[PDB]
From a paper:
Voltage-gated sodium channels (Navs) specifically enable the passage of sodium ions across cell membranes, contributing to the electrical signalling in cells. Mutations in hNavs have been associated with a range of channelopathies, including pain, epilepsy, and heart disorders, making them major targets for drug development. The NavMs channel has been shown to be an excellent exemplar for hNavs as it exhibits highly similar functional, conductance, and drug-binding (similar IC50 values) characteristics, as well as sequence and structural homologies.
Numbering used by the authors:
A (entry chain A), B (entry chain A), C (entry chain A), D (entry chain A): -1 to 91, 100 to 262
Write the structure that this text describes.
């Protein structure tokens, strides 16, 4: 229909995106002002009405999209489903309303592309992340059995051990706060903690670098495709096509 | 005119740059000596006169440049505008006079190229930086509402929360100083702080690596252009021109 | 024989790997539950029987493999030898039974490939690691002689000095906890500690980056070979073969 | 002469390097044992004689080299000059004798190549290092003037400010130890310290990454040259030579 097509063009315009972005920012500002515990009853009531107005504008925006794309066509996108859930959970009584400021990511295409690159890079580091998880679990069981009776606040149970080993991997007071006090009772505890630090810092840096390198390459391809319609072909494909042109001319020269 | 041309050649010489660099260093040294609170009145007066002499030499230098390049031609460069502002603000009464040691960057071309590469890499990481800003704002609102009444020095208001979340992202006493004391009152606070650390450290490292990788490539191109007049063409352009030469010879062999 | 061939196909199936993986996870869960010191005698007895059952399943699995591959054929693989040692040490009475959760790495091929890439990258960083070791040894001898009599808990002997220099390299309380107290007695101690930090942080980051970059490239080749049978040839080999095709056609055109 | 040639072949053999390496290790071990303050007079005397024996073996080694290469030919190498200085300073009475364990780097060629790559990468990061130095100097002058009277232990003078800003750049107790106590007196001090941290951590990581990336590439070329006599030509040179072969065959086909 012509009407649904005029609505799609309104939705996909730069001005509509700018208005929705401004309402997300306004809603985020009123939720930030609502943290101020010194506000008067009238000021709080006013800010709650601005929040209610912002939420109504998002309802109109979402309904406008579902009509212009169709129920199955709208829910086909993960970003639209996210926008729908974020707005729908506010209707029908979580206390974390500030999470709808995440709509700045879903509404702005360049920010959406950064997050997409990070999410798409996750499967590729799954085995490095599983290796770190295995090391953490093994270390937490060992630390609990080794130090739980003598240092129960840090290692009294599996949950406590996982927490203090995460602190140890981040290098936060690992020695003055944790390992020197442990070594006063268990002199060889450095044999456990120093290899734990070497392994986890190497593995977490491998995990982070793997995410970053891949996310940057995916996002760069997505930026190229969003502007020109296509991305730069990999150097391997360029060299493959160069070799194909050489086979075509070699078959020639030989007998032609 | 011949005079303006002789002045331009004086300004663009290696000896003039070396003299201006020496005056910036001398001015920086006298401002560093002026921090010593034990100095006599005569010693302070002497150093203030050396500072005044340095500032007069920069006025002569700047005027010499504005005459030799023209008002619009001088202000066409951002570095010249910076040099002009830095010297002009000293005339007419900020207390931070030490900021004119930044002229070492604007005067030395290799240092100027490092800063240029860093500034030019900023637009390309704008979406990663905006994502970190969104995460910080959301986390600061949540932390204020969750912990502000029980830990008001760290999370009593939005400003306090942003400050302590910046400390938490840098891993500084995050656990022994902040999260273990918070968990004594809110046992599940690790559910907030550990994902906050994982997300912000990954995102800030993505931001820093993106700046560094791009700044290094831009600065390297600028060094090449400043020495030879041109930079190394990207491998994609070399492979494109190689494919063009193959099309020219294939059209040949086929029927020639 | 046909029987050994039917057993090999059972062992190499996805379902057999999934069952062995589930038994490793179950054994890891019962060893994690056994850390809970509040368990009843009956609960502990039950968990010890589940652990015994898991260990028997691994014995059947290992025996099944040794028969289907031969004694020399099974021990030809380092992963099979690891699986054998891990299970065999449990029979005949270390207290660290949780180390058999490392079998998740040896049993899952994608996790095995991550560890293989890390182990294979170690020879290539051996000289960077030896340089860090030389710097640590020299610094520990100097720190012991310089500060051992005045700060014996941190530098009283070589072992203590190596431990506190490892803490200093990780930047943990290096200044508020170690160097400011040392400088109260030895004012120029920053001349030792600040160059030590600059050198070791640069060298350890070189060591970690060298491991990560190489492990990622080796693991990526191993993933390619495990799926297609071969890996992507290096760009140097592609350009070498491209130059060979040009020599074949140049010898032609010249006189043909 | 034949004798000098037989001596050069002895010096350049793998067995002579292995003997000199073993004497460096032995000398390092006796200097490490000499740190033990509980040793008897006889044990100390014995270790000092082993140190004296090691030093005599290095004198014979150095003299053997100066005769076999000539005075100007020996001193032509920076490593030989280093080996000469290190041994010669021990004769004629620094207390840091442990520095002759640095001869492990000069004697072992693969370790020598790592250090060479790091030294050769230094000129290329000189402008990034100068930028960090300029930022540190400016910040130290500002911090001294801003906080020196209220926090004289940390910022009382330029030297104190440089030290605590180096601690702040390493993120060590930057907030709980330095900036929160400063903000109790100067509430806006975060406006100084947070941009200082952002700038210096970005710049020091740029400095470290620039050193590492270049040192790794130089060392890899040096390893290739030491084994085969030549290094891998850069991809740019391979593509340049590929384009030259295309010009030779295009001039042909056109009219041949
Ligand atoms: C891979 C990273 C995994 C990090 C998270 C692991 C710990 C999660 C469980 C947990 O933290 N607790 C269990 C829920 O009660 C709370 C405590 O057991 C523990 O945090 C102790 O530190 C307490 O003493 C705090 O007061
Ligand atoms: C993205 C990074 C953003 C980091 C900076 C955010 C905080 C900026 C505002 C601010 O720090 N203050 C507001 C100006 O008054 C001061 C305090 O609210 C706060 O710093 C508390 O820590 C006080 O208790 C200090 O004494
Ligand atoms: C390359 C990294 C090497 C790091 C490990 C070096 C130290 C290993 C030896 C060691 O730590 N000790 C010797 C065994 O007794 C124990 C103590 O000498 C020392 O840890 C002191 O800190 C004590 O005061 C602890 O209570
Ligand atoms: C680019 C990195 C530069 C870091 C090094 C800068 C400081 C060097 C000078 C120095 O540290 N001192 C001057 C020599 O006396 C000593 C003290 O002024 C200072 O260290 C204070 O912390 C004292 O209170 C220690 O007790
Ligand atoms: Na700390
Ligand atoms: Na740190
Ligand atoms: Na600390």
């Amino acid at each position: 229909s012509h009407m649904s097509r005029k609505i799609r063009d309104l939705i996909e315009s730069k001005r509509f995106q700018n208005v929705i972005t401004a309402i997300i920012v306004l809603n985020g500002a009123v939720l930030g002002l609502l943290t101020d515990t010194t506000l008067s009853a009238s000021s709080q009531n006013l800010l709650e009405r601005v929040d209610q107005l912002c939420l109504t504008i998002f309802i109109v925006e979402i309904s406008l999209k579902i009509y212009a794309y169709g129920v199955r066509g709208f829910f086909r996108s993960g970003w639209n489903l996210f926008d729908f859930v974020i707005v729908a959970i506010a209707l029908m009584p979580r206390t974390f309303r500030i999470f709808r400021v995440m709509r700045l990511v879903s509404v702005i295409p360049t920010m959406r592309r950064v997050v997409q690159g990070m999410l798409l890079a996750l499967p590729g580091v799954g085995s490095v992340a599983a290796l770190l998880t295995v090391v953490f679990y093994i270390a937490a069981v060992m630390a609990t059995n080794l130090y739980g009776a003598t240092f129960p606040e840090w290692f009294g149970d599996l949950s406590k051990s996982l927490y203090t080993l995460f602190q140890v991997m981040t290098l936060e007071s690992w020695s003055m706060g944790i390992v020197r006090p442990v070594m006063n009772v268990h002199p060889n505890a450095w044999v456990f903690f120093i290899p734990f630090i070497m392994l986890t810092t190497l593995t977490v840096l491998n995990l982070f670098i793997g995410i970053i390198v891949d996310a940057m390459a995916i996002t760069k391809e997505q930026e190229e495709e969003a502007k020109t319609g296509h991305h730069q072909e990999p150097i391997s494909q360029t060299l493959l096509h160069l070799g194909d042109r050489l086979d075509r001319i070699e078959k020639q020269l030989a007998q032609n």
